[PDB]
Each structure stands twice: as structure tokens, then as C-alpha cells.
mmCIF file of C-alpha atoms in Angstrom:
data_model
loop_
_atom_site.group_PDB
_atom_site.id
_atom_site.type_symbol
_atom_site.label_atom_id
_atom_site.label_comp_id
_atom_site.label_asym_id
_atom_site.label_seq_id
_atom_site.Cartn_x
_atom_site.Cartn_y
_atom_site.Cartn_z
ATOM 1 C CA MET V 1 122.597 123.648 134.676
ATOM 2 C CA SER V 2 119.172 125.114 135.588
ATOM 3 C CA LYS V 3 119.018 128.420 133.661
ATOM 4 C CA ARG V 4 115.463 129.684 134.303
ATOM 5 C CA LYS V 5 112.751 127.018 133.861
ATOM 6 C CA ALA V 6 112.970 124.161 131.323
ATOM 7 C CA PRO V 7 109.901 122.033 130.440
ATOM 8 C CA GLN V 8 109.413 118.685 132.235
ATOM 9 C CA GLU V 9 108.687 116.556 129.138
ATOM 10 C CA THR V 10 110.583 118.748 126.612
ATOM 11 C CA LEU V 11 108.611 120.484 123.823
ATOM 12 C CA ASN V 12 108.391 118.243 120.708
ATOM 13 C CA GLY V 13 111.516 118.232 118.492
ATOM 14 C CA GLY V 14 114.653 117.594 120.581
ATOM 15 C CA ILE V 15 116.694 116.665 117.489
ATOM 16 C CA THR V 16 119.875 118.698 117.908
ATOM 17 C CA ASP V 17 119.750 117.808 121.644
ATOM 18 C CA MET V 18 119.926 113.993 121.297
ATOM 19 C CA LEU V 19 122.265 114.318 118.271
ATOM 20 C CA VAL V 20 124.775 116.553 120.038
ATOM 21 C CA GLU V 21 124.411 114.189 123.044
ATOM 22 C CA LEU V 22 125.829 111.180 121.137
ATOM 23 C CA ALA V 23 128.819 113.356 120.164
ATOM 24 C CA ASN V 24 129.132 114.368 123.847
ATOM 25 C CA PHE V 25 129.389 110.597 124.723
ATOM 26 C CA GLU V 26 133.131 111.162 125.449
ATOM 27 C CA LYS V 27 133.247 107.467 126.476
ATOM 28 C CA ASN V 28 131.629 104.944 124.106
ATOM 29 C CA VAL V 29 132.252 107.306 121.160
ATOM 30 C CA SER V 30 135.870 108.460 120.766
ATOM 31 C CA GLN V 31 136.690 111.935 119.367
ATOM 32 C CA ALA V 32 137.447 110.977 115.723
ATOM 33 C CA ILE V 33 135.315 107.967 114.660
ATOM 34 C CA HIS V 34 133.214 107.843 111.439
ATOM 35 C CA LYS V 35 129.934 107.136 113.284
ATOM 36 C CA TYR V 36 131.037 109.766 115.831
ATOM 37 C CA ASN V 37 131.211 112.515 113.155
ATOM 38 C CA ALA V 38 127.859 111.237 111.775
ATOM 39 C CA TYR V 39 125.964 113.019 114.593
ATOM 40 C CA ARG V 40 128.206 116.123 114.423
ATOM 41 C CA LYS V 41 127.553 116.910 110.733
ATOM 42 C CA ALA V 42 123.864 115.940 111.012
ATOM 43 C CA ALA V 43 123.646 118.068 114.189
ATOM 44 C CA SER V 44 124.908 121.083 112.179
ATOM 45 C CA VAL V 45 122.030 120.811 109.666
ATOM 46 C CA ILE V 46 119.457 119.796 112.350
ATOM 47 C CA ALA V 47 120.168 122.370 115.106
ATOM 48 C CA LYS V 48 120.096 125.109 112.421
ATOM 49 C CA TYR V 49 116.856 123.449 111.233
ATOM 50 C CA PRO V 50 113.707 124.249 113.298
ATOM 51 C CA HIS V 51 114.672 120.903 114.993
ATOM 52 C CA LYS V 52 111.132 119.587 115.369
ATOM 53 C CA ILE V 53 109.453 117.099 113.014
ATOM 54 C CA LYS V 54 106.438 114.760 113.275
ATOM 55 C CA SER V 55 107.847 112.197 110.799
ATOM 56 C CA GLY V 56 111.303 111.347 109.373
ATOM 57 C CA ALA V 57 110.899 113.218 106.056
ATOM 58 C CA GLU V 58 112.649 116.451 107.133
ATOM 59 C CA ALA V 59 115.825 114.511 108.046
ATOM 60 C CA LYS V 60 115.828 113.003 104.527
ATOM 61 C CA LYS V 61 115.932 116.551 103.096
ATOM 62 C CA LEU V 62 119.083 117.250 105.165
ATOM 63 C CA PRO V 63 122.088 115.833 103.214
ATOM 64 C CA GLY V 64 124.041 115.737 106.511
ATOM 65 C CA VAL V 65 121.413 113.637 108.353
ATOM 66 C CA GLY V 66 120.557 110.348 106.584
ATOM 67 C CA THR V 67 123.718 108.177 106.663
ATOM 68 C CA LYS V 68 122.614 105.866 109.550
ATOM 69 C CA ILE V 69 121.829 108.969 111.699
ATOM 70 C CA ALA V 70 118.239 109.368 110.398
ATOM 71 C CA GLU V 71 117.367 106.287 112.504
ATOM 72 C CA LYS V 72 118.200 108.210 115.705
ATOM 73 C CA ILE V 73 116.240 111.247 114.430
ATOM 74 C CA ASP V 74 113.167 108.965 114.484
ATOM 75 C CA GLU V 75 114.079 107.501 117.915
ATOM 76 C CA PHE V 76 113.204 110.849 119.588
ATOM 77 C CA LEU V 77 110.580 111.797 116.992
ATOM 78 C CA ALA V 78 108.951 108.317 117.112
ATOM 79 C CA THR V 79 106.683 109.055 120.107
ATOM 80 C CA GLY V 80 105.560 112.432 118.696
ATOM 81 C CA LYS V 81 102.247 111.044 117.368
ATOM 82 C CA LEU V 82 100.148 111.497 120.539
ATOM 83 C CA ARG V 83 96.550 112.767 120.223
ATOM 84 C CA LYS V 84 95.782 116.428 121.035
ATOM 85 C CA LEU V 85 92.294 115.956 122.556
ATOM 86 C CA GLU V 86 89.651 116.308 119.809
ATOM 87 C CA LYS V 87 86.646 118.543 120.637
#
């Protein structure tokens, strides 16, 4: 908790963070469910990934992420279409 100085609104991706979080549920998600392992396998191909996408095409390329987990990958990456101040 509190290592040096984390951003206030995260950077952009945040894929392996919200994916590993669902597996860390330790309450609503048991420790051996099918949907439970859906975020663990997808989190292995996402966290290794650059874990930062503007759309949901990168998750489709990952064979691990796509079986009902790709929807969550867009939940965090859905508000990543903000403008960057033109001119």
C-alpha cells in the first residue's frame, strides 16, 4: 500500500489490474469457478500484454481473453476515448 507515488486517475490501460481484481474477489467469486478462472487466464495474456488499448480489438487477439471476459476489458477501456486538446 503506497509504494512511492501512484497516479490519481490511473494512466490509460488498467487491464490486468481490473482483471486480477475480479479474481481477488475472494467473496462473490469462489476459488475454483469457471467464470472465476476466466479472469485468471485472460489476466495472464493481458498483464504480459502492454495492458493498454483504446478499443476492444487487442483483447480479441488474446485467445485467453474473449470468452465473456472481453466485455470487462471494454468496461475499463470504454472511457478511454477522451479528447487530447487539439491545437
